[PDB]
């Protein structure tokens, strides 16, 4: 079975985990619960293809210092998430893209830029500003909302689509 | 307003029109109605971006001989659809990809390969076979069902995503 090793990175607090749980077990966790490392595995059919999604939920805090280096070594594709109401988590993105190209040895790694939490009105990261980050990376920009599930499957499946042509 | 000129090509009968109507006016047309040329325009918000989708529904029959050349001249991105229960409509795809590169002057035009009608069990085009067409084009493969709307927005939005990095 084609297995897809997806890796959800991003600053602490952006909804990394709320998005994986949304995708996987069909409900929003409106709750403070910091991750260390949760992995998830699920039979899915993506575009007729039957495959296992083996997603590794990660912590955003660099208490997970170079413990990061390990999984970015093994991750095939990555969800880079930031919250659209948090310019700082946007500005952290360049940091992850850098570490990932680092351990991963390549300038172009399958990746998706994901502007999560779009359901809310206090947005400080404008869309085109994010669409301009994504384009300079040559990656897709997908806005999501783990609350309303808008974009949730879009962001995860497009990345599987990415890993394919790579 | 960013306008996206999408063009839905493909053999006669594959569901080209059922997919545009699904996207646009939220219901399946289980009905014989051959197209000549229907255009559609709709305000959408794709990834925070507010934009007009100006889709041109097309006929599959080459009674629309070189009347094709005109719109493929002007279309920015294209939905290439075939029915997964119709090996012939799959084999027609290379024909459209060829005409499109023709009038369009470029080897790589934003495009989406779309294996529509996936809800049904009489499938003669296997997914990976189609996933191998798509990859040799270096384009996304998206299976849809205008009946159940599975993939319907996926296929149209990913193409808008395509036109972006182009
Ligand atoms: C009662 N609620 C709180 C009180 C105090 C502190 C925190 C919260 C809290 O639970 O907020 C949560 C949900 C919210 N969340 C996730 N995704 C979305 C989204 O799409 N929209 C909205 N509106 N909220 C979201 O985003 C916050 C963090 O979610 P998470 O999924 O745990 O975030 P993470 O990316 O996994 N952070 P980490 O790196 O620590 O694991
Ligand atoms: C009572 N029904 C018929 C009787 C006789 C002849 C034709 C039909 C008939 O209506 O079949 C339709 C719907 C079906 N359709 C479209 N999409 C789907 C899909 O996703 N799944 C299924 N199950 N059917 C679909 O696909 C057929 C063609 O749909 P269309 O959307 O009109 O196809 P087109 O691609 O626009 N053909 P064209 O080039 O002529 O405009
Ligand atoms: Mg968490
Ligand atoms: Mg029609």
CATH number at residue A29: 3.40.50.300
Strands B49-58 and B37-46: antiparallel
DSSP state of A74: H
Question: Whats the size of chain B, residue-wise?
Answer: 166
CB B9 within 8 A of CB B19: no
Distance from CA of B65 to the nearest CA of A (A): 32
Q: Given the DSSP bridges, would you call strands B77-83 and B49-58 parallel, antiparallel or unpaired?
A: unpaired
Identify whether the C-beta of residue B60 lies closer than 8 Å to the C-beta of residue B14. Answer: yes
Assess contact for A162 and B165: CB atoms under 8 A. no
Question: Is B147 known to sit in a ligand binding site?
Answer: yes
Q: Which two tokens stand for residue A156?
A: 């995860």
Note down the domain range covering A62. 1-166
Query: Length of chain A, please?
Result: 166
Buried b (16+ CB within 10 A) or exposed e, A124-156: ebebeebbebbeebebbbbbbbbbebbbbebbb
CA nearest ligand 2 atom 2, residue: B31
Among A27, A58, A56, A23, smallest CA distance to A40 is for: A56
Q: B73: which 2 tokens? A: 């001249």
B152 touches chain A (CB under 8 A): no
Q: Beta-carbon neighbour count of residue A74 at 10 Å?
A: 11
Using alpha carbons, select from A13, A45, A14, A9 the residue that is nearest to residue A144.
A14
Separation CA A104–CA A94 (nearest Å): 15
Contacts of A12 (CB under 8 A, 6+ apart): A34, A59, A60, A61
Rounded to 10 degrees, the C-alpha dihedral B110/A157/A149/A99 comes to: -100
The answer to whether A77 and A6 have CB atoms below 8 angstroms apart is yes
Q: Does the beta-carbon distance from B161 to A138 stay under 8 Å?
A: no
| φ and ψ at residue A129, rounded to 5 degrees | -60, -40
Whether chain B has a CB inside 8 Å of the CB on A49: the answer is yes
| Residues in contact with A103: Cβ distance below 8 Å, sequence separation at least 6, in sequence order | A68, A69, A72, A73
CA-to-CA distance for B74 and B37, rounded, in angstroms? 14
Residue A146: φ, ψ to 5°: -60, -20
Residues 73-92 of B with CB under 8 A from A: 84
The CA distance from A76 to A55, in Å, is 10
Maximum C-alpha span of chain A: 43
Q: What is the Cα–Cα distance from B94 to A99, expressed in whole angstroms?
A: 41
Domain count, chain B: 1
Measured between alpha carbons, how far is B140 from A47 in angstroms, rounded to an integer? 10
Under DSSP, the state recorded for B9 is E
Which of B131, B138, B136 has its CA nearest to residue B114?
B131
Contacts of B11 (CB under 8 A, 6+ apart): B60, B82, B83, B86, B88, B89, B92
- Residue B54, CA distances (Å) to A23, A32, B76 in order: 31, 43, 10
Beta strands, E only, chain A: 2-4, 6-9, 37-46, 49-58, 77-83, 111-116, 141-143
Method: X-ray
Contact between A115 and B48 under an 8 Å Cβ cutoff? The reply is yes
First-to-last C-alpha distance (Å) of chain A: 18
């Amino acid at each position: 079975m084609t297995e897809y090793k997806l890796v959800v990175v991003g600053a602490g607090g952006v909804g990394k985990s709320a998005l994986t749980i949304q995708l996987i077990q069909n409900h929003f966790v409106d709750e403070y619960d910091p991750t260390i490392e949760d992995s998830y595995r699920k039979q899915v059919v993506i575009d007729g293809e039957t495959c296992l999604l083996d997603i590794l939920d990660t912590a955003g805090q660099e208490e997970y210092s170079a413990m990061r280096d390990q999984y970015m070594r093994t991750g095939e594709g990555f969800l880079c998430v930031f919250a659209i109401n948090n310019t700082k988590s946007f500005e952290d993105i360049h940091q992850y893209r850098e570490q990932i190209k680092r351990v991963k040895d390549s300038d172009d790694v399958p990746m998706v830029l994901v502007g999560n939490k779009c359901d809310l009105a206090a947005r400080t990261v404008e869309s085109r500003q994010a669409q301009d980050l994504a384009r300079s990376y040559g990656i897709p920009y997908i806005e999501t909302s783990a609350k309303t599930r808008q974009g949730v499957e879009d962001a995860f499946y497009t990345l599987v689509r990415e890993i394919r042509q790579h």
